Design a protein around this ligand. Sequence first.
Ligand SMILES: Cc1cc2nc3c(=O)[nH]c(=O)nc-3n(C[C@H](O)[C@H](O)[C@H](O)COP(=O)(O)OP(=O)(O)OC[C@H]3O[C@@H](n4cnc5c(N)ncnc54)[C@H](O)[C@@H]3O)c2cc1C
Ligand SMILES: Cc1cc2nc3c(=O)[nH]c(=O)nc-3n(C[C@H](O)[C@H](O)[C@H](O)COP(=O)(O)OP(=O)(O)OC[C@H]3O[C@@H](n4cnc5c(N)ncnc54)[C@H](O)[C@@H]3O)c2cc1C
Lengths: 497, 497
Amino acid sequence: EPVVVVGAGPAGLMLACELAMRDVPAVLVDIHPTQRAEAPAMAINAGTLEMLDQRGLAAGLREGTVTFPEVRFADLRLAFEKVQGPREPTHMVLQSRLEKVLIDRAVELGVDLRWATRLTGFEEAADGSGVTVTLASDAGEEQLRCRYLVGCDGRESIVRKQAGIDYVGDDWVIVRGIVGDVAINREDVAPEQYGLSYTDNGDQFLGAPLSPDVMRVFSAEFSTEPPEFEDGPATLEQLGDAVKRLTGKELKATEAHWLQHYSIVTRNAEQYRKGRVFIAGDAAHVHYPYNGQGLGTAIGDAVNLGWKIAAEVHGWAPADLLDSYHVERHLAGRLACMNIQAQLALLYPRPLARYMREMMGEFLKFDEVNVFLAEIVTNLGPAVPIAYEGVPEPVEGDRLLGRRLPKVQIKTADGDMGVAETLQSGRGVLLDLSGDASAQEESGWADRVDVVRAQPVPDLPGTLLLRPDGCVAWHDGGGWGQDELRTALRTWFGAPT
Amino acid sequence: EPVVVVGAGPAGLMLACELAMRDVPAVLVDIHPTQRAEAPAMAINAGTLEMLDQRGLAAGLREGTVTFPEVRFADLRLAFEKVQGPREPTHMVLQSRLEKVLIDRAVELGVDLRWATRLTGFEEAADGSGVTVTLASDAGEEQLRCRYLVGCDGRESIVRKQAGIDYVGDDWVIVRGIVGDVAINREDVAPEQYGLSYTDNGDQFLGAPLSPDVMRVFSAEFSTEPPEFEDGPATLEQLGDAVKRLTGKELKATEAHWLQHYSIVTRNAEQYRKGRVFIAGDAAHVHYPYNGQGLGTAIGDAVNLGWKIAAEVHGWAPADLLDSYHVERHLAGRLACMNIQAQLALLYPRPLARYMREMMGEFLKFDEVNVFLAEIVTNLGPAVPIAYEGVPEPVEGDRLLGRRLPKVQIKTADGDMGVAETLQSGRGVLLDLSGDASAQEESGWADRVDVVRAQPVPDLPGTLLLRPDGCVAWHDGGGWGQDELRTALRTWFGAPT
Ligand SMILES: Cc1cc2nc3c(=O)[nH]c(=O)nc-3n(C[C@H](O)[C@H](O)[C@H](O)COP(=O)(O)OP(=O)(O)OC[C@H]3O[C@@H](n4cnc5c(N)ncnc54)[C@H](O)[C@@H]3O)c2cc1C
Ligand SMILES: Cc1cc2nc3c(=O)[nH]c(=O)nc-3n(C[C@H](O)[C@H](O)[C@H](O)COP(=O)(O)OP(=O)(O)OC[C@H]3O[C@@H](n4cnc5c(N)ncnc54)[C@H](O)[C@@H]3O)c2cc1C
């Protein structure tokens, strides 16, 4: 019986995929007649690449795409090379190219996607075993009965609203500006300034030439006084004042494909799950767009929740399972909101930025804060907490537990392999890196866990257990072994067959 | 040929002692008729205690006074137990009690101390051979010819302004309050108003009793619009009003001995020195009063600068030694201003504080952050940078170089003492902790440096060289030896004789 997703944005597309690949029905609604043209995001950080790699959604959208190597906290530099294991630079695949990869993958799996469809209301069952939901369409109002409802519908989520869920947060300034694309003149070399510049008050402009003709525009201006223009469709010459004030120069590039005023607000819903309803992505948290974190956490919420919903659809999910979704992702929600606000504080207000910058100068000389911030801003981090009653804590400096593996090559049967492609089935993975296949395969979970035998791998333990979202749930590099291994599968994977 | 010190707070008093204990003629000018009563500070931190221990001024202030062993950042806890070596809790010593012992020490060491005397100006001679100063007593105007002019005359330093050094800083909020001592019953006419009362805005109220009839009172209020009253004498009715809104009740007020309006800005002088004119304490840097840093840096300033000036007077100072006053002490002012302001940003405004508290919450899980901040707010504080030509920077992290040693016993054949006590002669110390007098003392510097032969001390190297301000300029627990020590001696104590 169906599961309803609202929003064909990055969070909803991925989650519908996550579901359908596990043979669970999923209907995905969206107001847009077609895939939207206003996908502002351009970047994807390493953390999000690993999650796409886990579904084979990233080979291909690497290629031709160029990468940038720094990872910055405001304009300060983080020492990303201090993160454990080999990782990835941020890649420059447009959000629209990624939404389509997710669209045409969603339906190939079997997603009932409905463009031009808005959810306008929903009601829990007095039983509680379902949620009746109503949908406005060109054809008129339908009323579908679903088994779980997930609102991936952005900052103004009605799913979040009608569910009773508070949207906590606060801002001390309002950043605002415009984002979009403008034509160029072509055959002749283009001129002007366009590299991301700052002014002495925190104001930023960036011309990003996507491709010979087309260049994306972003500006960001700080002030307490409420935005002038109420966040709509803009016009090209609201924009050209925009740059002239900030740049000094004039725009001089005709026509504007799509443009969008925006304003920021920092929010993080206090509950990610109420009963049978869930919220995810910008529906659950929103903030100034830095480091690709909004797209990072959106994809990450879906991956987290998808396999967990399927698990209880097929009746093996421990009672704990779906509550762990709120636990692990409200933490990532909190850490994202937090660090982006901390980055703003180094730009505005200028009396505050002055001392916070020096402050961060002092912290960034410490290796733990460089590594902590780097895992956070690239969505490698929030390590989902891993612990089991009774079992001895793994000694001390273990940074594999509750994280996804570095981008390391696995050598198995035939064909070397990225570690994250072992999760493309959708199941758990027990990694055996002995080189001879010695580990005891606890067969009772073989329906939900795949074993993969391979040669040992530098600074990685002899064997590892992965949840279907890729988080390392067990390994034997520390004190752990087969006994701790079992209680780890009882958790996260339920009762053995 | 005198040295003129303007201002008899901690800074100027402490320096006049540093100058007079070394037989440098010092004349210390203040305008008060007697020692002031407007000395609000109730606390002395561990770094200030060590610097006073170096001159026998700490014991005596310590007996009978309370300690509390928590070092806070804003209102969070700092893991002070992670700071190297044994050290001290903050002791609750009253500013006027401290100033009294330094006025005492000054008059016996022969400082010409002048209450009711104002410095109205000064000029640097064209050649530069001296400064001529002008002092304004009731009798008239002495025009005094002196050798160096040190302005320790407080936040509104005439010396700084007339020397034309810019006073750098900014604030996003203006903190205002009043402070002083009311007379007022104690038993049960202090309710809520006992101990500090952080409220549901950044605003605090501190009520601390001295004797059962007098109480010291402190208020600190955050607002985005200028202080109602100019800084100055204030009325007790004005305090009654302020207490009611903060504590919620009213103080059964009897009489006011002294109370004062205060506002807070944050500034760091750009140059603590302009050739023959130095500045120190509040004239060099000011900020919100936290952790005792205003007092620590003030005393720290004088301990650094008295001995360098004395060396120049005595003619053995190296050429670049007084320029290290600015280098060493501007950094310490920088970092005090920086982290005070950082502490304030966990209080106000409340949107900023919301996330900056979560942020610091994450950073204080790290040892290097706890130790760095705890060191600075206790004025154990900025390690003085120690490097020498030829000598290559020692790879391992050294917690002793550039810092005053931890509170350890050192046992001599003539008796035991704490290590800060060996610097009481005013001279540098060569600590030979071998137990055998195995260290080869460079007899050249025998007149500027004392050898102290003591028993080995756990977790300290076998030999150490202390500059007259207690700072470790050399030790042999890394790779350094007799040649590096000879380098250290030339750069800090000058030519060998
Ligand atoms: C100017 C700007 C620049 C940005 N730059 C970046 C960047 O460089 N890198 C990055 O990672 N992130 C960036 N972001 C943020 C990032 O784009 C968002 O986090 C991400 O697109 C939101 O993920 P989402 O799918 O949950 O929300 P959305 O993108 O808002 O998708 C929600 C979808 O649900 C639709 N919907 C369908 N039906 C309904 C219904 N009944 N009710 C409500 N909605 C419905 C909505 O129309 C929408 O299409 C930027 C944001 C802005 C404003
Ligand atoms: C409300 C308030 C609360 C405080 N709370 C604390 C606390 O909790 N803990 C702490 O450690 N410190 C506290 N302080 C003080 C802080 O430490 C100061 O930095 C320190 O007292 C300043 O020392 P100083 O000697 O450089 O300047 P000052 O103490 O200001 O002394 C300067 C002296 O020079 C005099 N003078 C000025 N101009 C002239 C002139 N031309 N000629 C002659 N004399 C002149 C002045 O009258 C004064 O006597 C507080 C101060 C205030 C106002």
